[PDB]
Amino acid sequence: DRYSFSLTTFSPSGKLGQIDYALTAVKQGVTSLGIKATNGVVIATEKKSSSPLAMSETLSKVSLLTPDIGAVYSGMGPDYRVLVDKSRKVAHTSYKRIYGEYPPTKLLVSEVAKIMQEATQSGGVRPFGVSLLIAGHDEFNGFSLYQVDPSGSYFPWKATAIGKGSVAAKTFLEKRWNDELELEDAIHIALLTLKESVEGEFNGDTIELAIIGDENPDLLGYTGIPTDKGPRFRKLTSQEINDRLEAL
Amino acid sequence: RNNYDGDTVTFSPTGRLFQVEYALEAIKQGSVTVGLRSNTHAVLVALKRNADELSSYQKKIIKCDEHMGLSLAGLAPDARVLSNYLRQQCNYSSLVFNRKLAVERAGHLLCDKAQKNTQSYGGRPYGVGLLIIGYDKSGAHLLEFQPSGNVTELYGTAIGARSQGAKTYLERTLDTFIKIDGNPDELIKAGVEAISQSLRDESLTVDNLSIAIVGKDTPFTIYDGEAVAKYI
Amino acid sequence: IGTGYDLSNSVFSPDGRNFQVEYAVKAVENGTTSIGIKCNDGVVFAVEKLITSKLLVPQKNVKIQVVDRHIGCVYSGLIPDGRHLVNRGREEAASFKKLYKTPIPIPAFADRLGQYVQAHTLYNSVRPFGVSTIFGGVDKNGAHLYMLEPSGSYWGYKGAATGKGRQSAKAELEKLVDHHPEGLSAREAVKQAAKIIYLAHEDNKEKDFELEISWCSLSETNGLHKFVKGDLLQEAIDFAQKEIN
Amino acid sequence: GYDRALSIFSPDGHIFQVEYALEAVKRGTCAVGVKGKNCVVLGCERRSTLKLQDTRITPSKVSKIDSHVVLSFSGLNADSRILIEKARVEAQSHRLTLEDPVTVEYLTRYVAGVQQRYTQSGGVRPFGVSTLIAGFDPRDDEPKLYQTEPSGIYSSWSAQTIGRNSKTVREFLEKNYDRKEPPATVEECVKLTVRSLLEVVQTGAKNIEITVVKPDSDIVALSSEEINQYVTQIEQEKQEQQEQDKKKKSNH
Amino acid sequence: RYDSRTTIFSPEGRLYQVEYALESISHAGTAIGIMASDGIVLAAERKVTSTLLEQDTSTEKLYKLNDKIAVAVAGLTADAEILINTARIHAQNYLKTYNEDIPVEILVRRLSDIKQGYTQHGGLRPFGVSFIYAGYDDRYGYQLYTSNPSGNYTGWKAISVGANTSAAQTLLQMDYKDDMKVDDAIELALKTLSKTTDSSALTYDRLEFATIRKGANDGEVYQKIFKPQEIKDILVKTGIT
Amino acid sequence: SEYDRGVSTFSPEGRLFQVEYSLEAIKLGSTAIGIATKEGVVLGVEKRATSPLLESDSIEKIVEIDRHIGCAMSGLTADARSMIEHARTAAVTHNLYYDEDINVESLTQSVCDLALRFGEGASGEERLMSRPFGVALLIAGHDADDGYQLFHAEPSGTFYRYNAKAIGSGSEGAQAELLNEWHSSLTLKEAELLVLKILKQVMEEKLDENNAQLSCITKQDGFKIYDNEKTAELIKELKEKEAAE
Amino acid sequence: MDIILGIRVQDSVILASSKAVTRGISVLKDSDDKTRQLSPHTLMSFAGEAGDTVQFAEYIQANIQLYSIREDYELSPQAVSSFVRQELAKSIRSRRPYQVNVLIGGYDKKKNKPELYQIDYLGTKVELPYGAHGYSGFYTFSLLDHHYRPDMTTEEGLDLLKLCVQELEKRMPMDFKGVIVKIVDKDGIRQVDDF
Amino acid sequence: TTTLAFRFQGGIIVAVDSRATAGNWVASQTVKKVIEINPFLLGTMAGGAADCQFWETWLGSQCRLHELREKERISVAAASKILSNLVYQYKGAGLSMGTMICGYTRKEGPTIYYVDSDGTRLKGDIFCVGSGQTFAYGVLDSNYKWDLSVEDALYLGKRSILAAAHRDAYSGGSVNLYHVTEDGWIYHGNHDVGELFWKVKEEEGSFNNVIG
């Protein structure tokens, strides 16, 4: 009641009403999920066209924050875009002068968290409508995956999911997850889990699935340097998703 | 409803605000003054109030300049903020332009200043009426400033408690005092008659009279005691 | 009503309007009739300033005020509130002259005034405006007539009207489209303006009025705005009285 | 109501924030000030519950404002923290500007000024803490004892109890205290202060904190052994007096 | 009700807001720091868990703020992040300014002023967090304190916060041996953690632990957050596993 | 309702109720009386005693604002602290600028100018002091250009000059008695015994000096706050005079 | 003009400072206090630029007293010496300078050793048990260390210091009007007369 | 300018000139070079004429404000130290100060502090400030006695002005004498240097260069 007409006071059972509503706002979104393996990380989402005429191919819901780190969301569409904007800016500032190349995954998550936290702090501000997943790859902690909550807390995970179909996806991932998976194997889990959510439209035109694995000097835009590391992030096209989607 | 009895930033269904309306009330509980003017003079006659007979009575005439001056009827706190402002503008015109500020021109600055507080949600809105006299290049003028900010040029007007009889004196004798020019004596006497009728269940006394006069030949001077027991 | 929707200006109704902006329009209605008539070589502005007592001084209180020396504006609704939109308007006018060394085009002014009204609805701590403003002049492109709503909506007009007696005015303006498809020439429109305000004063009848007319005309006021006063205004008065009878 | 902000008084002339601040005082630990003629003994209740709870590192209930003026306090302990540091920085700053020792009358007046400023404002609330501030200056051998209130009032009292169950101690203090001759013995001033605080602690002399201020910048904190010495002597006299009263009854 | 701004007071002369922050602790995990002359242990319990949760290569309720002082968390985690970062910044100011490590009493004291400041000033929340501070300074040796969500500190030799504080406290003070040992701290903590927690078999992936010692590799202080398999060793001694 | 919550909301009187309530704060406060004569102004006060431990002779209630200016007060000391610190600066700043005494009337204006702040901001007055002042002062001094003048600085309006004025709890009965007992024939000494005569009547405690404190403004003497011995003596002369009549 | 001397003996730190202050061609007084106690067991002698010595001395004294009083136990000579140095290091990068050289001679109770530090006007903290600044250090870097016996006492150091002073008057055209010698030990700080 | 001051047992004698010089012209021959801070404290005017005048009366605003606030007579030390803070802020703005604050109170004995515009507060017993402060020291130091009578102390400061006035190029006018007792400065009249010089020449047997 008054514990989300105001942000000052709390429920006597803990937490603001605003946070529990912010999670409701997450589930009203598309379904996004990530699975970590020991030689890769898959990140996968669906995109609701929401008009036969809408082009969701022109805006994808998998967006590189920096070349080695992509992110997805589940939750409100407008809220995602500004939040992504601030991710690209802070990243250069915070570590592309400290290390002169793009940050650790781990670092950018602690930064993002402070921003989400500050909108839970005071009245006359609202939480963000999303929970994000940030996946990336660095050499200092290896492959990682994270879930970043609009409460202002963040949790690392091996595989997790969020969105409308989260509760179905989570039990599914528990069963099929093993101690060593391949990148290819984790893509083959990722398609099945998301297909539980939406069926009767599943194709790689409507489902976007992409990976964080090894460097691409092909998406780097240069070669001829013995130390160069191209984007750990990589987009599969519509055609490549179909090759994996047949493989099931 | 009267959900608008609190909001000064939110229109009332009539198209008014209640706050502006209550501000007219404040004037009614306020102390009476009668204005009137002619081409070559303007006079303010005001009633001093007291709470007892060990009070030495409230100044109702504030000298704004040596050629302009004002009187009040309503909230004395609100009257102070606007008096400060008003002297600051008349001195500004004498500093930069070696110029007297016109009665009419002063009034348009005061207008923006009322409506600023209406627009805002911060600080009190006004609740005093000022009767303004001056004598500029365009002879004596009489403005009635309202706490709304509406400024009205008349030949005679009145604000304060029981001010509807001053308007009735002035209406009848409207023309008598247009014809008199160059006689400060006559114009002073006319306000005194005026404010006897205005008042009810009171009588005038010597030290209840404060008459403030400026014209073309008369400097800005305030008459008290023996200088106003000649026109009672 | 309740449930917001008028209780703040940010909040929006499910209908597509805002009931706080509707009470501001009611305040324009309550104010005294103003008209503006566009012409094929000028603009004429007229206003009804009613006389409530004869204690007022005639030709000394008006709602006609000038901006530069060639843009006339006249306001209806809450009287000190219309003054203020002109006072800020005047500030906006000056800025443009200093920077570009040119007189302001009337559609340029038209953009700039309506941005002030709109800023006063984006904040719950700022009361909107509650005044319509008829405006126009002669510029580079010739004569133009506009009117601005307290919504923060505006459009160009051939004949415009606002205030309490606006029900008559609107009707006389229409007779004019048919009568003259040039909207009438600027000279004969000063007389047309007076006659209009007289039929409008039949809706205010219990009281007397004072009529002020001003104009700005390409070559019959020489690109400049000046007040219609003198033997000019009295001829306008005589035409009105004659044809009403 | 009139309890919605500090910009509204009630029609009695009260502001309910201040009135609930006075109930706040009563929540936290008790304090007693009692003046002598060469001393002021400023004593306070020390809260302990559990054995774990230390009395080494644990926050003291007496804070040294300077080397000749001290302050003990009563109210919320969390609230009183901001108040403690502020009063010490101001203490040093007096001496930076002027180069003079910290005047007691100035010190209370400024400190109650901090509280007043918040009360004056509506956007910030004051502390619910009332203090006792006792001291001497090198230029005075005439003792001063002051009080602050959560409103922004400063007062002078000969002798005072504030904080937890002040009321009963308050009447005991009146009778014994003489304004004729306040306790000239220093030991007896401490002993009175022990008797007063005795009432509110129940059993304790590891829960009684006594601290003593004397002229020309002498400050002491009295060890646990000395606080326990008072109790043995004070129980012997209270009991003795009681036995005697019952003998007066037997005689008649 | 009093709920609108923190610039108000309830009739207890406290604020209802402070009570609401209090309650925030008692729906989070349980936290225990036991001090001994030979080292201080910090322990926290995880309030989420899964088998696809990464918690074996990470901690979340244990931060070192400098290489001589560590903290445990009980409360919401969203509240925690902001104030940890500020304590750590204050430590490195101390290091920069004075050329030495901060005392325990100040570092806590600052943090306590800051919590109270959000109560004191504005309509901004109190931050419902209780942190256990276990530190070293060469003035009062080992020092164990905790900080209140109201914003005050009190010294200790053992304390529990979190969920079921009362239940935990009685159990800790019963088995407190008066010289104490870091090895007994470590042993006591697991036992006490078990009974509050709603699992009957406490486990190392469900555990966060740091032990602080200067009593071995003397003349210097070395603080060690334990790795998962070591936590398993100490569990086997207490007979839980 | 929405009238006692807000400093920017007037009620059907056209007033604030913030301003109203602050009068009742003064009536809470102890009785204080000032009586002007042409010999000097005499400022008397009441203090209270409910404890034998309360030292009431070691804190002030009559204060020196300059070297010929004194003030008595009633209401909260919190509201009084701000007011007197302010008023100290105004007199001091005057001696800087001109190298002359402050006049009595102008000191009154400054105190009522602080009083005006009840809220947060305003155009033509920045407000930083967010409540009404629940204190008044009787302001007494001497200028040479008039004489001795005695004023009441009102926190709720503008200032009213008096020849004798009572404030506080017992203000009501004191005011009637001063009309029938203030006269221009009454010497310095008579002025003292008059204040104590009224003072006791509305006191709920015996007339004694531990609950009283007189002072005078004599320019010749500078502003003098009295000793306890002088007041004690005078309680005795008061009772012997009235014993015999 | 304006000298400050320092010797660390194995139980005390002995700071000396000139009694002379010259503004213009005029010696203003032959008795001038030019050394202040930061706390009752740590002493700062100071010398340097015209009237900066006065403003800076009182500014530094007040801060150390606040921190000693705040902690409720006086800070080490090690804490004190970084702080003073850091104020100076900010100032030369700020728009207003202070260029005041100082010595901190404290008795450290924390580890029981006397501690003489040399803090530069530049703002450089370096530990040296024979430090000295301005034009003094041109003569006493060599005089102290020639006669310097690796263990020292309060007795030994005072005769050697007196001697140092006796050289300075002779080979500078200056007048220091003697020097006051205040001795920093475990019993606090005291004034003792010397040449 | 020659201003000088010295403490003695019976109080502080402050002897000043009256000569104001601007260029090689004389600006005035009447100007009191003692600013009366309050009825217990005297400061002096040497250095900038403007600076010393404003800041010492301002100094007077602080003194008055202190008595009103606390109802205790200000210390000699409290005032000087405050003018030390005030002049430092306005340092680097072409400011000048060459003032001696003197007073004798029941809690501190006679005390004199030198204030300089560089933030200097210097303790002494004998001070001289100005251009011709040097001449003031030579005569005054050598005939200085702490145990000295009022009539004689007066004579000594007078003679310090007379020899200093004579041989300097910026001084003379008249000799204005003030003696600060515990009850503040007492004026001791104005003695023109011109006439005065001649009676003292005879009495002493000094100033052997002129015969009239």
In whole angstroms, give the CA distance from residue G15 to residue C200.
100
Cβ contacts of E172 on chain D, cutoff 8 Å: 52
Q: Is H169 annotated as a binding residue?
A: no
- Write out the two tokens for A216: 């691409």
In whole angstroms, give the CA distance from residue C56 to residue B167.
11
Question: Which residue in chain H has the smallest CA separation from G53?
Answer: H120
Whether chain H has a CB inside 8 Å of the CB on D157: the answer is: no
SS3 A157: strand
Question: Which residue in chain D has the smallest CA separation from F1?
Answer: D1
Q: Which of D146, D202, D196 is nearest to D171 (CA)?
A: D196
G120 burial class (0-12, 13-18, 19+ CB within 10 angstroms)? middle
- Write out the two tokens for B89: 């503008």
Query: CB–CB of G100/G48 below 8 Å?
Result: yes
In whole angstroms, give the CA distance from residue B212 to residue B84.
19
Cβ contacts of E8 on chain D, cutoff 8 Å: 3-5, 17, 125
In whole angstroms, give the CA distance from residue B115 to residue B203.
37
In whole angstroms, give the CA distance from residue H179 to residue H166.
23
SS3 C220: coil
In whole angstroms, give the CA distance from residue F189 to residue F35.
12
CB-side exposure of E178: number of CA atoms within 13 Å?
Answer: 1
In E46-174, beta strands by DSSP E: 62-66, 69-75, 129-137, 141-147, 153-156, 158-161
Q: How far is CA B153 from the centre of its chain?
A: 12
In whole angstroms, give the CA distance from residue H160 to residue H174.
13
Number of C-beta neighbours around residue B175 at 10 A: 9
Question: Which residue in chain G has the smallest CA separation from E105?
Answer: G71
Cβ contacts of H120 on chain G, cutoff 8 Å: 23, 50-51, 54
Query: CB–CB of B49/B199 below 8 Å?
Result: no
Q: Which residue has the tokens 């909040």?
A: C11
Backbone conformation region of residue A237, classed left if phi is above 0, alpha if psi is from -120 to 50, else beta: beta
Q: Please judge whether E176 and D52 are an interchain contact, meaning their C-beta atoms are less than 8 angstroms apart.
A: yes
Q: Which residue has the tokens 């003998």?
A: D247
In whole angstroms, give the CA distance from residue E155 to residue E135.
12
**Obtained via which technique?**
cryo-EM
Any idea what DSSP says for residue A239? H
SS3 content of chain C, % helix, strand, coil (to 5): 35, 25, 35
Strand partners, C51: C208
N-to-C CA span, chain G: 17
Element holding A192 (H helix, E strand): helix A183-197
Number of C-beta neighbours around residue H144 at 10 A: 17
SS3 D122: coil
D110-123 as b/e: b if 16+ CB within 10 A: bbbbbbbbbbbbbb
Query: CB–CB of H194/H18 below 8 Å?
Result: no
User: Angle at the Cα of F195 (from F193 to F200), degrees rounded to 5?
Assistant: 95
Chain H residues within 8 A (CB-CB) of chain F?
57-58, 60-61, 64-65, 68-69, 71
CB under 8 Å to E1, separation ≥6 — which residues?
A2, E16
Residue C173: phi and psi, rounded to 5, are -60, -35
Number of C-beta neighbours around residue D211 at 10 A: 21
Sheet hosting strand A32-36, strand order edge to edge: A159-162, A32-36, A41-46, A207-212, A233-235
To one decimal place, what's the resolution in Å? 6.1
How many angstroms separate the Cα of E33 from the Cα of each of E177, E181, E192, E232, H106?
15, 13, 11, 19, 60
SS3 content of chain F, % helix, strand, coil (to 5): 35, 20, 45
Q: Which residue has the tokens 């060639």?
A: C70
Q: Please judge whether H61 and F96 are an interchain contact, meaning their C-beta atoms are less than 8 angstroms apart.
A: yes
SS3 E8: coil
Q: How far is CA E111 from the centre of its chain?
A: 14
In whole angstroms, give the CA distance from residue C12 to residue F35.
63
Domain extents in chain H = 1-212
Nearest by CB: D53 against E8, E140, E154: E154
CB under 8 Å to A131, separation ≥6 — which residues?
A23, A26, A73, A74, A75, A147, A148, A149, A150, A162
In whole angstroms, give the CA distance from residue D33 to residue D43.
7
- Write out the two tokens for D133: 């501030």
Sheet hosting strand D31-35, strand order edge to edge: D159-162, D31-35, D40-45, D208-214, D218-221
Q: Mind giving me the DSSP string for G17-55?
A: EES-EEETTEEEES----EEEEETTEEEEEEESTTHHHH
Cβ contacts of D98 on chain H, cutoff 8 Å: 75, 77-78, 81-82
Q: Please judge whether F88 and H65 are an interchain contact, meaning their C-beta atoms are less than 8 angstroms apart.
A: yes
Q: Which of F237, F167, F207 is nearest to F24 (CA)?
A: F167
Marked catalytic residue, from C3, C32, C121, C221: C32
Nearest by CB: F10 against B19, B77, B82: B19
In whole angstroms, give the CA distance from residue F9 to residue B3.
12
Q: Which of E19, E114, E120, E178 to mutate to test the interface with D (most CBs of D within 10 A)?
A: E120
- Write out the two tokens for D112: 């109650």
CB under 8 Å to H151, separation ≥6 — which residues?
none
Strand partners, E35: E40
In whole angstroms, give the CA distance from residue C240 to residue C213.
13
Question: Which residue in chain C has the smallest CA separation from B167?
Answer: C55
Residues 123-152, chain E: which have Cβ within 8 Å of G?
138-139
Q: Do chains H and A touch (3 or more CB pairs under 8 A)?
A: no
Any idea what DSSP says for residue A222? -
Query: CB–CB of D40/D48 below 8 Å?
Result: no
C7 burial class (0-12, 13-18, 19+ CB within 10 angstroms)? middle
User: Angle at the Cα of D163 (from D157 to D164), degrees rounded to 5?
Assistant: 135
Query: CB–CB of H84/G54 below 8 Å?
Result: yes
How many angstroms separate the Cα of E116 from the Cα of each of A12, C230, G155, H148?
20, 75, 55, 64
Query: CB–CB of D160/E43 below 8 Å?
Result: no
In whole angstroms, give the CA distance from residue C71 to residue C146.
11
SS3 C160: strand
Any idea what DSSP says for residue E27? G
Q: Do chains B and F touch (3 or more CB pairs under 8 A)?
A: yes
Q: Please judge whether F81 and D116 are an interchain contact, meaning their C-beta atoms are less than 8 angstroms apart.
A: yes
Sheet hosting strand G42-48, strand order edge to edge: G35-39, G42-48, G100-108, G113-119, G125-127
In whole angstroms, give the CA distance from residue A107 to residue A101.
13
Backbone conformation region of residue B182, classed left if phi is above 0, alpha if psi is from -120 to 50, else beta: left
Tell me: cis bond preceding F180? Omega within 30 of 0 counts. no
Query: CB–CB of E163/E26 below 8 Å?
Result: yes
User: Angle at the Cα of D157 (from D153 to D160), degrees rounded to 5?
Assistant: 100
Cβ contacts of H58 on chain F, cutoff 8 Å: 96
Cβ contacts of E116 on chain D, cutoff 8 Å: 78-79, 81-82
Q: Which of G40, G32, G80 is nearest to G60 (CA)?
A: G80
CB under 8 Å to C38, separation ≥6 — which residues?
C136, C143, C144, C145, C157, C158, C159, C160, C183
- C52 catalytic? Reply is no
Chain F residues within 8 A (CB-CB) of chain B?
1-3, 5-16, 19, 112-113, 116, 118-125, 127, 156-158, 160-165, 175, 178-179, 182
In whole angstroms, give the CA distance from residue H53 to residue H43.
9
Nearest by CB: F130 against D11, D12, D121: D121
Whether chain F has a CB inside 8 Å of the CB on D100: the answer is: no
Nearest by CB: D174 against F52, F130, F132: F52
Is the dihedral angle over the CA atoms D85, D89, D92, D95 positive or is it negative? negative
Residue length, chain C?
Answer: 245
Q: Please judge whether D98 and H75 are an interchain contact, meaning their C-beta atoms are less than 8 angstroms apart.
A: yes
Is the dihedral angle over the CA atoms C151, C156, C162, C165 positive or is it negative? negative
Q: Which of H94, H96, H132, H89 is nearest to H115 (CA)?
A: H96
Whether chain H has a CB inside 8 Å of the CB on G50: the answer is: yes
- Write out the two tokens for D248: 């007066």
Query: CB–CB of C102/C94 below 8 Å?
Result: no
Query: CB–CB of E158/E170 below 8 Å?
Result: no
Nearest by CB: D20 against E9, E115, E150: E9
Q: Do chains E and B touch (3 or more CB pairs under 8 A)?
A: no
Q: Mind giving me the DSSP string for chain H?
A: -EEEEEEETTEEEEEE---EEETTEEEES----EEEEETTEEEE--S-HHHHHHHHHHHHHHHHHHHHHH-SPPPHHHHHHHHHHHHHHTTTSS---EEEEEEEETTTEEEEEEEETTS-EEE-SEEEEESSHHHHHHHHHHT--SS--HHHHHHHHHHHHHHHHHHSSS--SEEEEEEEETTEEEEEEEEEHHHHHHHHHHHHT--TT---
Query: CB–CB of A60/A47 below 8 Å?
Result: yes
- Write out the two tokens for B175: 């023309």
E1-30 as b/e: b if 16+ CB within 10 A: ebbbbbbbbbeebbbbbbbbbbebbbbbbb
* Min Cα–Cα distance to chain F from B1, Å: 13
Cβ contacts of H64 on chain F, cutoff 8 Å: 67, 92, 95
Nearest by CB: A123 against E54, E82, E123: E123
Cβ contacts of A10 on chain E, cutoff 8 Å: 20-21, 23-24, 128
Any idea what DSSP says for residue F5? S
User: Angle at the Cα of D118 (from D115 to D121), degrees rounded to 5?
Assistant: 150
How many angstroms separate the Cα of F135 from the Cα of each of A143, D5, E21?
70, 19, 38
Catalytic residue IDs of H? 1
In whole angstroms, give the CA distance from residue D139 to residue D123.
41
Q: Please judge whether H78 and D98 are an interchain contact, meaning their C-beta atoms are less than 8 angstroms apart.
A: yes
How many angstroms separate the Cα of D175 from the Cα of each of D172, D196, F50?
6, 12, 14
Q: Let me know how many helices (H) and strands (E) chain C has, helices first.
A: 6, 10
* Min Cα–Cα distance to chain E from G90, Å: 12
Q: CATH for H1-212?
A: 3.60.20.10
